[PDB]
Every structure is written in structure tokens, then in C-alpha cells.
Amino acid sequence: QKNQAVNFLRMSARVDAVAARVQTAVTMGKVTKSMAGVVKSMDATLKTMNLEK
Amino acid sequence: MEKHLFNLKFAAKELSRSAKKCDKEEKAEKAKIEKAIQKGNMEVARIHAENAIR
Structure with a gap:
């Protein structure tokens, strides 16, 4: 559960970044x-x- | 004899009505000129100006 927390939260970061630039x-x-x-x-x-004029 | 009186009055009121139309068309034609020259067309603007005058 904890390492998943890391992994997901990382995806949240990067996807958020692309979201910003879009x-x-x-x-x-x-x-x-x-x-x-x-x-x-x-x-x-x-x-x-x-x-x- | 009445017949000719009635035709004369008729012709008079006729001419008045037609004059009235031509005038109305004149105003409408001013408007139409403005729409025309709004684009920058210098030809349509011409023949419209002309028809307005006549």
C-alpha cells in the first residue's frame, strides 16, 4: 500500500504538469x-x- | 362624360402612388448603398448610387 502510494502520487505529479501546460x-x-x-x-x-476623413 | 372624369382622377392618384413608391425605394436605396460601401466595393456602390439618384 505504501509503495503504491508513492507510485500513484508520482503519476499524479507528472500528469498534473502536462495538464498545466495544456x-x-x-x-x-x-x-x-x-x-x-x-x-x-x-x-x-x-x-x-x-x-x- | 363621367367616364373621362373618373379616368383622369384615376390617372392622377396613379401618378401620386407611383411617385410615392419611387421615393420609398430611394430611401431603401440609400441604406443599401451604405451596406455596399461598407465592404469597400467601388462598383456596386456606383450603380446603387446611380439608381438612388434616378
Whole structure:
């Protein structure tokens, strides 16, 4: 029982780590998409709003 | 003789109604122009502007 406690708990560690980096990957994804969004909408609204007018 | 009176009044109210339509279409056509030039299309924007005017 005790050595199993060690083994499992170790798996918990490493799997948790990958879980963290995947988390970062997803949130990064959201930020990227949304940012693309603002760059575009702002761009097509920068074409008819171009500074001279 | 009445027949001609009635046709004249009819033609008058006719012209008024058609004028009314063309005007309504005019406003709708302004809107449609704005949607058009929103993309950046300089051709559709043209013939729409034109139809609005006419």
C-alpha cells in the first residue's frame, strides 16, 4: 500500500504538469483567436475610417 | 362624360402612388448603398448610387 502510494502520487505529479501546460495552450488559443478578431474588425473599420476623413 | 372624369382622377392618384413608391425605394436605396460601401466595393456602390439618384 505504501509503495503504491508513492507510485500513484508520482503519476499524479507528472500528469498534473502536462495538464498545466495544456491549460496554457488552450488559454493561449483563446487569446490568439480573439486578438485576430480585434485586428480584423478594427482593420475593416480602419479602411473607411482612414485618418484623412 | 363621367367616364373621362373618373379616368383622369384615376390617372392622377396613379401618378401620386407611383411617385410615392419611387421615393420609398430611394430611401431603401440609400441604406443599401451604405451596406455596399461598407465592404469597400467601388462598383456596386456606383450603380446603387446611380439608381438612388434616378
